[model samples]
Every structure is written in structure tokens, then in C-alpha cells.
Target: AKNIVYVAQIKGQITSYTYDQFDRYITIAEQDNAEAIIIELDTPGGRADAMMNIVQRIQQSKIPVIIYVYPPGASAASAGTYIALGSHLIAMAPGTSIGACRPILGYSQNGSIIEAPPAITNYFIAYIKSLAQESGRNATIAEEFITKDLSLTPEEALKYGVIEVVARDINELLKKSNGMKTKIPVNGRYVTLNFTNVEVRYLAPSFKDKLISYIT
Candidate 1:
């Protein structure tokens, strides 16, 4: 089996369509017979439903998934929180964050419309609960992300089993994902090698993914 690396290039926010577009990007990798998919993420989060959809695919993936929240000062808040947790391997850089699942507009809060009161937040918690249960993670902590707006450091996250490890950047992320395996929906243990240096490609944002990100 071969390894694959996918990058989200820019250091910014992730939108709803961003997840959908990349979701397909990952699906294609699975089809390509790749062992795993590494997403270079440095976002402040995006749409809640989008996060759930992305995570669901990861959970059901035939190939392992690694979500790397990279670069110093970058974050994986709101929706990014869930996406990171859903992956088979979660890694972050020294200056990146991995919590604060407070519901917000597309990626940022500059101009997008809010979903409405606690409704969106509740949905986020439910989604996190499902993920926590499936992955045997701490459901209590995962649920706090949405309601309490809790943000955990790399060490704290690892302590709670939310993230496996924290690496400085892409190179190390690949090194981390290489020897792990994830359970399949109806199959046996699927072992995979995290693709090495290999070409780290980017999912050039589509016009729609861009608009959604610019929403507020």
C-alpha cells in the first residue's frame, strides 16, 4: 500500500463546503488504494454539520485518516475541533489549539450568519458524543467542548485521549501516522503505513468554499 499527503495550504479558517470538498478528496484517496489521508489543517473551525459529515466519513473510511493541525498560532476550534477528533490520528504543532467548539459562522465570525441560540450548540454536542463513544474517548470532555467552550492543550488533549500526539509540523505528522490502524465497518484490523514525505498536495479552495469562508 502507498501513502498519501493532502494539505490545506493556507493558515486560516475552514468552511462548510471546505469540508465537503476535502471529504471527497479523502474518498478519492481511499479509492486510489492509499493507506492513509493526511490533512494539513490550520483553521479556526467552520460549519457544524460540515464537521460532522467530515468526521463521519473518517469513521467509516476504509483507509486511516490523520488530521494535522499545524503551524504556530493556528487553531482547530468550533467545527475543526470535531474534525480533528474524528480522525484516526490527530496531531498538532507547538502553537496550535484543539478545542473551543463554540458554534460560530463559517470558519470565522467576520460576516457569516449564526445558526441560532443553543440549537446549533446542541447539535454539536450530540455529534461529539457519537464520536467519543465510537472512538472510546472521554465523552464528558468531548461534550464540554460544545457547551463549555473548553479548549485543551496538546498535552491535555493527549491525556484525555482526544489527540494521539503533538508534532511540530507535516514531516513529523507523517512519521506519527505511519504505523497505526483503524477498525473497519465490517472487516478485520486494517493496518496502514502513514505515507512518508511524499508529495504534500493542497486542496485549492473552490470559489464556493471561499465565499463560505469569507462569510463573517
Candidate 2:
């Protein structure tokens, strides 16, 4: 696993356990001194608390974090949008899309969707704008994803500066992302991501992960 790029395929609802899984991956990446971690994400979104935790983990990572909106017909919706925004690099497959991060605070007793208070929505708006700004995505257009329900394909996202690479597979993802520069902020230095001869190792989730995630 030398010069490795750890990979995690995360789809469906992102619950409490998803954040725990991210912590494990980041810890393992740090221990292995891996080149980077690629989160292959496709979700309609999930709990805001879990999303916040994932965002913090990615934002604070010593190693570069790459979020790929993967697979044909997959999505990076709701919470996925925020997590992608916090990462050091973002990419999408040809037919993949990203955005629509408006938060859903809670539901009524009948389980019907309910609009969250403006204060909560406003908080999300500001928080997402900051993540996008820090990550180099255009803050203005990024906010519309939350407020206006805007979504875009890979081409459109790249055109709008909301994402970088547009690749069909991991090879293309690595090839296109190689030589890209990002910061290792914990040590206050910058590093270039060189995937030269690098191998991606996909980390499988534990049995407990499946059981916990299934409850969500």
C-alpha cells in the first residue's frame, strides 16, 4: 500500500455511522501516510449533524481530500454537496450531477416534510457559502444550490468552477488530478498531489457498519 490513494464508495443515506466511517478512513490514511483519500459519493443526502461532522473531517484533514460524484446516473445531492464543497478537490463522472444542498431540519408527526425555520436555512446558506469559498468554488453560484435547488452535470459544474475533474473512471480521475496543488494546513505547508505510479486501495466497511447504516 505504498504511495496509495485510499478509496471509499459511499452511497445512499449518510447517517451517524457514515461520519464514523470517515473518521476511520482518515485515521488509516494518516497512519499509512497515503497520498490522498478519494470519497466516491452518491447520495440524496442525510442528517445535517452527520453532514457537518463529515465536512469538518474533510476540511481538517492533513492529506488532500478528493470527492468524486461517481457512476452514471448517481448524484451528489443535499449533504453530499456540502461535503464536496469542503474537500480539497472535486470531480464528477460524465452523466453525474451535484448540488441541491438545502437542509431539511425535521418532519411533522405524520412524517410529512416540513420547512425549517429561516434561521436554520440561513445558517446553512452561510455555512455552505463559506465552505465553497474556502474550497475555491464560486460562493455565489454555490449558494443557489441550497436556496434555489440548482443542480448541474459534470460539464456545467466544471464550467461554473464548482468542480474540477470530469472523468469516466478512477484512472482518468487520477490522471487528471495529478500535479494538482493543495495545502496541508495542519502543518501549514502546501503539497502537490502526484499520483505517479500510485495505486488506489478501496477500503471495505466492517460488518458493524452495514448493520448500523441499515437502520438509517
Candidate 3:
């Protein structure tokens, strides 16, 4: 099947539990044996711990994951940058971008934050490098994206391997997945997408999970 896994909209600062929520959603896709995960993201980043946890899950996941910044004005920056790097593939619409991983920290002056210190910057660079290496991408490029605050268009990202392909729309994206090896999570099997007229299923959070998400 060539269906996309959609991440539902939720609000709140990311916490350890936030990581759990995201992980559980991924687990559902894994158990259901979905071939890939794609997200439409719009965020200014979140907690470092949550981002790390998400990265760990992506690293351990048996299936390919794709994170696409979509709908013209969305962004995948900072913590989102790390998550995008963690994906097996990443994509963006024409007006989307992926960068600015520099973190901000509060200095406690009427709700002000200083840019994170050098140690933190170094850590982020290291983290991006690690993820890029895992994805068979140039670590230096990934580091520079963060260190230099670089941003790229969808086509530019695909050209540089930050993304595998650029599509004008999601249906065209599904078309790209046609005949692609649908990586199986259980045994790393290469099953070609029987990509006929497969109806896209939106994997919304379950009602109970939605309730918990709402409360949290």
C-alpha cells in the first residue's frame, strides 16, 4: 500500500510524554506494517529531550520515514530540523524550508532568551552530523545547514540529498513511490508497492489518544 501516515495537529510544549505520544503513533504504523511515515510539519521546534527521543525512535524504527514540510508556509526548523534529518527521506513544498537549528535559552529578563551557548551549538552540530551520516548524506553539509543557518527549497534539498525527491503535490509524491521498494519493518524485505489506485488513509490519532493529547 502507498498510503501516507499523517501527523495530527496538537498543541503544547514538548516533554518526555510528548515523545511517548509520538513514539506510540509510530508504533501503531509499525505494527500495522506501514511502509513509511510522512509528516506535514509547522513548528518552531520543541524541547531538546523530546527531539532526542524522536531521533532515537526514528533511528530504531524498522521502516523508512519521510518528513515533508508542506502547504506553502510550513517550516521544519530547529528541533524540527533534527527530526527531518532523522528521516529516511525529507521533502518540502515550494515555499517550505528546513534549517535554523540554533537553540534559544531564556536569560530571565522579562521573558528573553539568549542564543544557546557554544557547547549547545557544538552538540547540535554533532547531532546533525550523526543523523546525516546515518542517512548516507554529507555530515559537513548537515552541520553547515545548522551552523550557517542555511535553508533550501524542495528542489534544492533533493539536489543536495537532504531530500530524495521533490513533488509539487502529495499525489505526485505517491506517484513517485510507485514501484519503489516498500521497506518492511519486520525483516527488511523489499516489497514493491502494489501501487495501483491505493486510497490514501489518514492516520489520525485515536479518540482516546486524542483525549490524552488534548489534556496533556
Candidate 4:
């Protein structure tokens, strides 16, 4: 069987819509037996619950998942940072960046900005740490991305082992990653995947998917 790479984009806010879209793409890739799934991400971050769902899905995916911070000036900030950390491979474009996983405190029903207690923040810190540690990233830096709102450039991320590659574009990323092997966390175990000759396939959300995004 030929190696196939399925590429999906995660832009804007990370909401339930992001999870649903990613979930569908992963399912399709699994069913089609794709060798790799690349998620192009540029988000300021959204709901924690939504991000967690996406993280869990990536962790359990049979296909190796690569999260790429793309467009040379985009970012994977806030909850986006954790999603990147959870992926099997993390890549960034020349000018792209990742980190700043600080948990946001939302307003009350009455529109007052409520402050989160240390206990709440601590829980998220631990959660992000586990994601980084499990994915072979820098756990201490991951914690500071939350506690200290640390952000890293592509060079900085690669230097710190927060990301695997810094490619100029998707084409370069794939070419550079050829023959690279990844171990993905699935079913509470790590599954090894080797990248050889691969064909790239781009996927987008359907009309129904877009509609559901607005409604949800």
C-alpha cells in the first residue's frame, strides 16, 4: 500500500467545532489507512474542554499525527499549544510560533471577569505537563507556557525539544520527514510508524460541518 498523508487545517478559535472537524478527519484517515495526518493549526485558543477532546483524539489515533504551525506568521497559542504538544510530530514554519498555554478566565454570567484560583490553574498546569512529557516535549517549558505565558519562536522551540522540525512549507516538511519514524500514543501504548514515499491529500470541512460550527 502507498503511503498517504492527509492534511487538515485548524484555524481561528478552538471550539467544539474544531474538535468535531478534527474528529471527522482522523476517522477518515484511519478508515482510508493514511500513513500520516498533518494538522495545520493557527489559533489563539478556545475552550479547554474542546481542546482536551482534540488532544485525546490525537493521542488515540492509529495514524501518526503531525501538528504544523503554518503560514510563517501564525501561532498555536493558548489551548493550541497543548494540541501541538500532544501530536506525534510537531513542526513549525519559518516565522511561525507556538506556546502561551495560559488558561483564560472567562466572565461570569453577569459579565464580570472572574479570577481563577490557584487550584484551578494548578490543575491545568499538571494536565499540560503530562501532555508534554508523554509526547517527548519539554515539560518544564510547557508549564511556563501556562504559568509564565512563555512563547517560543521556531528556532527556540526546536532548540528546546518542543518541536521536531522547522520546515519552510508543507512540501519541505514532507520531504524532510521522509524516512523519519514516529511513535504515536494509542490505546495506552506507543505505536511506531515509518515515513517513506508519501502522497499528500488536503481535506476541508463540508457545508454541514460549517453549519454545525455556527450552531454549536
Candidate 5:
């Protein structure tokens, strides 16, 4: 039981359905008394409210949650950037990238990216900055992820302290992450998380989840 680690995957767009699935998996991990929860992420980002729901769950989780940008060529863009930062530990694959979180209005008449109003943009900038600060990451650099549309490769993210590990794959990730100490929220307080000898358990989505994903 002590060695059990639950792994859940979140791919593509993030919607309320996706958040619910993530939350459900987390709950199952908790129920099963898993040591940690690993989220394999590859998203182009999604609805802010839905992302926030996932983020809030991460903030309140007692089980250590590790967010990994995986599959080599994947990304954690837009709202996904914030979700990645909120995790206890972050890792990226060699070819993965993160950032470009600037909020924007839909599209202009000419099909160019229409920037959001200043008030909305400022709010998100402050919000992401606050998340970075809370995570003990680089706040200024995170602000740049939104304001300057700065994206960081795995190496750059490691250099800028945006991510802790740049692992080649899940095997390397678990190897590099062993013995690390992280934090998890419990009963309105932060609890210590230590990774030692843990076994990874990959969880596949259920039929209901697949149906929801297809429809949404």
C-alpha cells in the first residue's frame, strides 16, 4: 500500500467534464490510500473556470500531485500553465514546452488574436503571479509567461526554475524524482510529502469517461 502511486492522464482540451474526471480520479487515489498522484498532461489549455476547479482541488488535496508535461512533443499552454504550477512537483519531457498564457478575446474580424481587455488581462496576470508565489516558483518569470507570451522549453524551464525536472520519460522521471520532498494541503494546512520506494499504477479512463470526452 505504501508503494502505490496512482497515475491519471489529462489530454487535449480541459472542460468541466475533464475536471470532474480528474477530481474523481484524485478521490479514488485518496480512497485507495495511494502515495502520490501523477497527472500526465498534454493540453493546449481550456476554460478558465474549469482550470480553476482543477487547481482548487490540487490546492486542497492531501495526496501529493505531480504534473508532468509528457509525450516529448506535448505542451501545457494557457490555463494548463497555471494548473502545472499548482502541483506539488513539475516535470517536462525533452521536447515539451510550457507557457503562452495570455488571456485573449476570441478572434478579431481579420482573424488575428484579439487581446482581452486590460482589466481582465491584469486580473489573470496577478492571478498567475500569485499562484507562482504560492508554489515558491519564479513569479516574475511566470508573469512573463502570460504578459510576454513567453514559452519555455524543457531546458529553459529548468534554467528559469519554472519546472524542477526535465526527464526523458516516465521511467527517468520516477528515477529523478525519488527521495524528493514536496508539500500537500491537508485540513487548511500544508503537509510534507516524501517520495521513496513507490510503485506507479496507471489508470485507464472508464467507458463513461470516454463517452463524456467524446461528447465534450
Candidate 6:
């Protein structure tokens, strides 16, 4: 019973409630026992807390979570970078890019995107490195994403070991990602994901999620 691979999209900026909205679909897919989950994310990143929460969910996910930076001009900047790192797999559109993950951690007065202290930056660097290492991605590039505010196009990211498939659309994505193998911590084994000949169901967000996205 392959059923359908549930696809959920999160657009605009990420928020605190994003985790809840995203988790709802994940839970549904898990209950349905879907083998793979794809998130078509088009975000410029968002609140720091929201970012980590999403990553945590992805980290604990039983099914392989594939983060796709969809649309030609979409991006996976800042928090998006970390979220992608936490995923089991990644795909991107032709015109899309990933990285530039410099987090602005400041408790300053003016609130003008003050740079974070060395301690904060170090903590984040190590965390991203951990995520990259865990996911078997390029930790060097992951670290430089924060340290150097590095961004890369799909081709560049693919060449540098930052992402997997660089597909133009969902069909191409599914075709390209088919037979890709990734580590599943829950099973403590490497799972080869089958994306071919599978139905796709897009999960719609709730009204609360709509409002949260609109408001955020």
C-alpha cells in the first residue's frame, strides 16, 4: 500500500506556529503509513525559535522528509538552510538557491538586525554542523553557510554536496529522486526511497495555519 506521498507547502516567512501546521501533515502521513513526505518550501526564513522547532520535527520523523525549494525563484535562506539540513533528502528548482544562513541573534536596543555575539554564532555553527554531519551532507559547506553567509544555486549546491536533485517540477523531482537511499534513524538503517509510480496528495493547511501565514 504505497498510497500517496503527502506534499505540504509552507510559503512566505516561517513562524512559531509553522511547526504545528507542518507537523499536522506529517502526523497524517505517518498514520496513513506513507513512506515519504515532501515539503515544498518557499520561504525567506523566519523566527529563530520556529526554525529549530521545524528542524526538531524533521529530525524525529520516521518517514523520509524531502525538502524541495520549489518555483523558479524560490529560496531556502537562513532558517530554511537548517531545516533542509535536517531533512532526509533535498531537491531544488532550476532557479532556486539554498543557504545564506546567517542568524541575527540580538538583544540590542534599536532592533536593527544586530549581529549575534561570538558565543551565539559558535553555538549555531556547531548545531548546523551537527545537522549536516547527521544527515551525511557537507558539513564544511554547512558551516560556511553561517560563517560566510554563503548561498548557492541548485547546480552549485549539487556540485558542492549541499543538495541532491535539481528538478524543474514535481514530476521531474519524483523521477530524479526515485531509488535514492537515505538513513532513517528510527529504523537504524538506510532506506531506499521509491518515488516512482506513487500517487501524490497535497495537504491543505487549516484556517489557523492560513491566518498564521498571512499574519506572519
Per-residue lDDT of 182-209 in model 2, one digit per residue for the tens?
6224335566788999988889988887
Candidate 3, position 58, lDDT: 71
Q: Judged by lDDT relative to the true structure, which candidate is superior, 2 or 3?
A: 2
**lDDT (Cα, tens digit) per residue for candidate 5, span 1-216:** 366788888888989887887898888888888778888899998999999999999888868788999988999999899999888889999898899998887987865778788999999899988888888788899999988999999898988888887888777878787776663355465544445666778889889878877876
lDDT tens per residue, model 4, 1-216: 248889988788888888888899988888998888888898888899999999889888877888999978999999899889888888899888798876768888876666678999999999988988887789989999988979999999999988988898888888777765563565555544445566789998799866765774
Stretches off by above 4 angstroms in model 4 are: 107-114, 186-193, 209-216
Relative to the unseen true structure, what is the C-alpha lDDT of residue 35 in candidate 2, on a scale of 0 to 100?
88
Off by over 4 Å in 2: 108-112, 183-187
Ranking by lDDT: 6, 2, 5, 4, 1, 3
Q: Rate the local accuracy (lDDT) of all candidates.
A: 0.69, 0.85, 0.67, 0.84, 0.84, 0.85
**Candidates' TM-scores?**
0.75, 0.92, 0.79, 0.89, 0.92, 0.93
RMSD of each candidate relative to the true structure: 4.5, 2.1, 3.6, 2.5, 1.9, 1.9
lDDT of 4 at 86: 86
Tens digit per residue, CA lDDT, model 6, 1-216: 364688888888888777887788788888888878889988888888888999888878767788999988999999888889988889999999799988786556755568887998999999999988998789999999999999999999988888989998888888998888873364455678887679998888788777776766
Least accurate 10 contiguous residues by lDDT in model 2: 182-191
**Pairs of colliding residues, candidate 6:** none
TM-score preference between candidates 3 and 4, better one: 4
Model 4 TM-score (2 dp): 0.89
Number of clashing pairs per prediction, in order: 7, 0, 0, 0, 0, 0
Candidate 6, lDDT over the whole model: 0.85
Report RMSD for candidate 3. Answer: 3.6
lDDT of 3 by residue, 53-86 (tens): 8877876776566666776777777787787788
In model 3, what lDDT does residue 112 have? 73
